[PDB]
């Protein structure tokens, strides 16, 4: 498997579902100076999808993407 | 350079077994019997 299509595809899929499908569900579930949300990560995205969400759904995509590459690499392996 | 001299045990064993305990007991004894103002 080519790493670019697999990792890009999985990342694209997980960003889409996080923005169009489960964004509403996550927001409903989601809803001394080192413990306060001092910086509000404001975004111009119409649906409220901000950088923190991008890191989260993007991280899942990368993790799932490498799992596909790792599992496939085993097939045809020697001494393993 | 880390190796201590061959005579170190002859000094440190008496030092930590007789001398330092004697000082510690004497120091502690005076402290625990000291009267507060």
């Amino acid at each position: 498997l080519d790493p670019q299509i697999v990792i890009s595809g999985s990342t694209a899929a997980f960003l889409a579902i996080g923005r169009f499908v489960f964004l509403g569900y996550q927001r409903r579930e989601a809803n001394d100076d080192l413990q306060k949300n001092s910086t509000i990560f404001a975004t111009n995205d119409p649906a409220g999808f901000n950088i923190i969400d991008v890191a989260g759904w993007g991280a899942l995509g990368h993790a799932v993407g490498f799992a596909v590459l790792a599992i496939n690499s085993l097939q045809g392996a020697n001494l393993s | 350079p880390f190796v201590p001299p061959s005579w170190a045990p002859s000094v440190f064993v008496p030092l930590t077994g007789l001398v330092l305990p004697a000082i510690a007991m004497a120091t502690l004894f005076v402290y625990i019997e000291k009267e507060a103002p």
Binding site: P3, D32, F41, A59, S73, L74 | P4, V13
Partner: protein, 733 residues
């Protein structure tokens, strides 16, 4: 008034020898100190934790320094099988010439002690090869010790004292500890194995001077970034590899061989590297679960409030438990001790059966010492967990704030819990003792065929499920036609099945009726110890006998001879009783482990299989038979290197017996006796010129229990340690 102790004005005004004793005993009970505030309490604990850390690293520095300075590590690595590790040198002016000669062993110039801690096998497995390696590690850990000691001082200073809210940020601490303290540390240890330990086991030196120019794998990170992760599993070390040399060595760095290295009879270094890499990923991910300053993750309070069964079977469920746990340091410490206490036992059970360190299995004394060492520590830690659970109920528990939740409902059926624990303990005691006694009588009358020998089929069935073909059950990993056997047949089953079907190691030892009886003895010990500790916790706040017990605190002498008599009614006394049972239980566990390995190591498992079904067999064949070399360490005809253990053996018996004095004879007798001595001193010329500053008194009721238990416990431990080491090393040394 006396200054000491500064933290208790009530003690400082005590005019008797009580004050010094209680000044020491109450020193670390911060909550009871004069003027203590919640915020100051947390800051004091934080500084103390830095003190513990520096002590631990200094202790590790000392062990590294003395082995490098006085050990034979460099000689040991050339022939670990036939050389005894040296712990440190002896310098004792009380020795006679014969003792100097006797303890001169292992190739050292002068008298030395033989190490039983297994640090040699551990340091050798991780890549240490020369005394210079040990020296540098020693200096590094001393520096780390100093830094932690300084950090403890620093965070006590006015501008570096964390606020109370900082200490109560559960979500943030869990995130960092799971991903950083657990995950990154595990990831970093993987790097050491890949970059240093694995190359060293293949005859290549990798150190700080060249580790940036040596490739851990012939393909450097190319497989990692392209997803071809199987490139790292190719060409593992062969079955003929000689540890520490390049002969028969491979190139893989991440494998799943799943057995033992044939020469060292320990876990593969490439399996231990892949283990920590996978654990690191799991923990790093787990550390992104809880909410912090970034608007994602879980709030722990929200999770707890949600988990309430709809039927009302748990009442209010977990409502209010976030504040209960978060506001109680004793609830937290109870949880920490219970978790670490169980983990310590897991370490003991897994390290003997799946030895991770090279040449650990063949060092019989080290194997025995390590299992016994960690199981006793686990036993003490478990008692503490329940002790602080009982302290929680008194000091911290608030019935109003836990109304109807699971915690308050445990108190609602405490009689049901205690009475069922009582039934289980009675059943196990009656029938386990009964069966042993029946077998002793059958043995005594010369009819061993009439004894009751119940096969442990349930446990043998589990062993068969894991691939042990001895019992013929033949299913799961024991059945060659099962899906479980087939699916893993290319990953780890070949190595695992080879190891589990070899009866010369400790991986799922064969078991029989003798193993059946002793396992029910262990269950008797666990249940009875839990009964005493649980009863102590659940009755800590009150009973029908003492309804207002919570008004008297965790530890107090008694409530007097009234109402029938109330000796040992406090929750503290329940813990005191429980320690005796913990020692008895661990004693049964370790006796079992030791005797079963002694007969395996001697090639005669039949002796255990035939003698362990009755108690005279344990007395005659385990204790009496294996004491012979120990008690001859010195005698009228001379002495040998076991004289120290012979002396310590009796030393242990003496301390043990001295403890019986404090446990059996109680205070009033001694207080009257001391008064006659007070009279005598004042009436004696030339001696009444000297006088005391603290009026002598007998030890207090509570203090006698603790001191007596301490003597009992120390003598218990020392006696067995001497017997364990001397009987094993003398046999195999």
């Amino acid at each position: 008034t006396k200054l000491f102790p500064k933290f208790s004005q009530g003690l400082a005004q005590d005019p008797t020898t009580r004050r010094i004793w209680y000044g020491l005993a109450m020193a670390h009970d911060f909550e009871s100190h004069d003027g203590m505030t919640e915020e100051n309490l947390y800051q004091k604990i934080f500084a103390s934790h830095f003190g513990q850390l520096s002590i631990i690293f200094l202790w590790t520095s000392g062990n590294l320094f003395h082995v490098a300075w006085q050990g034979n590590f460099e000689q040991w690595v050339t022939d670990p099988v036939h050389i005894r590790p040296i712990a440190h040198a002896i310098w004792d002016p009380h020795f006679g010439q014969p003792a100097v000669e006797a303890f001169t062993r292992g190739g050292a110039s002068g008298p030395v002690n033989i190490s039983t801690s297994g640090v040699y096998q551990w340091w050798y497995t991780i890549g240490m090869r020369t005394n210079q390696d040990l020296y540098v590690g020693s200096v590094f850990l001393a520096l780390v010790s100093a830094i932690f000691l300084f950090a403890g001082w620093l965070h006590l200073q006015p501008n570096f004292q964390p606020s109370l809210s900082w200490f109560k940020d559960a979500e943030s601490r869990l995130n960092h500890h799971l991903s950083g303290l657990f995950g990154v540390s595990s990831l970093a240890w993987t790097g050491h194995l890949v970059h240093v330990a694995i190359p060293e086991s293949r005859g290549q030196h990798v150190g700080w001077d060249n580790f940036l120019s040596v490739l851990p794998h012939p393909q450097g990170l190319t497989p990692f970034f392209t997803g071809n992760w199987a490139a790292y599993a190719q060409s593992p070390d062969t079955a003929s590899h000689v540890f520490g040399t390049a002969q028969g060595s491979g190139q893989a760095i991440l494998t799943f061989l799943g057995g033992f290295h044939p020469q060292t009879q320990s876990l593969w270094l490439t399996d231990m590297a892949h283990h920590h890499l996978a654990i690191a990923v799991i923990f790093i991910v787990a550390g992104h679960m809880y909410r912090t300053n970034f608007g994602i993750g879980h709030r722990m309070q929200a999770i707890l409030e949600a988990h309430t069964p709809p039927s009302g079977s748990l009442g209010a469920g977990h409502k209010g438990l976030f504040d209960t746990v978060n506001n109680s340091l004793h609830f937290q410490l109870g949880l920490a001790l219970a978790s670490v206490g169980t983990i310590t036992s897991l370490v003991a059970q897994h390290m003997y059966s799946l030895p991770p360190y090279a040449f650990q299995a063949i060092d019989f004394t080290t194997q025995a010492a390590l299992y016994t060492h960690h199981q006793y520590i686990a036993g003490f830690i478990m008692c503490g967990a329940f002790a602080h659970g009982a302290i929680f109920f008194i000091r911290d528990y608030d019935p109003e704030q836990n109304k109807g939740n699971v915690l308050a409902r445990m108190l609602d059926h405490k009689e049901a819990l205690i009475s069922h624990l009582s039934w289980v303990s009675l059943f196990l005691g009656f029938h386990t003792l009964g069966l042993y006694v029946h077998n002793d009588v059958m043995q005594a009358f010369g009819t061993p065929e009439k004894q009751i020998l119940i096969e442990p089929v349930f446990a043998q069935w589990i062993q068969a499920a894991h691939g042990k073909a001895l019992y013929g059950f033949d299913f799961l990993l024991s059945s060659k036609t099962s899906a479980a056997f087939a699916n893993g047949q290319s990953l780890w089953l070949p190595g695992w099945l080879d190891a589990i079907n070899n009866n010369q190691n400790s991986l799922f030892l064969t078991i029989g009726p003798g193993d059946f009886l002793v396992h029910h003895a262990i269950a008797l010990g666990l249940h009875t110890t839990t009964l005493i500790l649980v009863k102590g916790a659940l009755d800590a706040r009150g009973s029908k006998l003492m309804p207002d017990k919570k008004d008297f605190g965790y530890s107090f002498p008694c409530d007097g001879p009234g109402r029938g008599g109330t000796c040992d009614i406090s929750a503290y006394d329940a813990f005191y009783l429980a320690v005796f049972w913990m020692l008895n239980t661990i004693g049964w566990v370790t006796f079992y482990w030791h005797w079963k390995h002694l007969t395996l190591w001697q090639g005669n498992v039949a002796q255990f299989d035939e003698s362990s079904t009755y108690l005279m067999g344990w007395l005659r064949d385990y204790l009496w038979l294996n004491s012979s070399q120990l008690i001859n360490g010195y005698n009228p005809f001379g002495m040998n290197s076991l004289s120290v253990w012979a002396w310590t053996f009796l030393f242990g018996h003496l301390i043990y017996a001295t403890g019986f004095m404090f446990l059996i004879s109680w205070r009033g007798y001694w207080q009257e006796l001391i008064e006659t001595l007070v009279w005598a001193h004042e009436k004696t010329p030339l001696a009444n010129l000297v006088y005391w500053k603290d009026k002598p008194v007998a030890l207090s009721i509570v203090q006698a229990r603790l001191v007596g238990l301490a003597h009992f416990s120390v003598g218990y431990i020392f006696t067995y340690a001497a017997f364990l080491i001397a009987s094993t090393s003398g046999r195999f040394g």
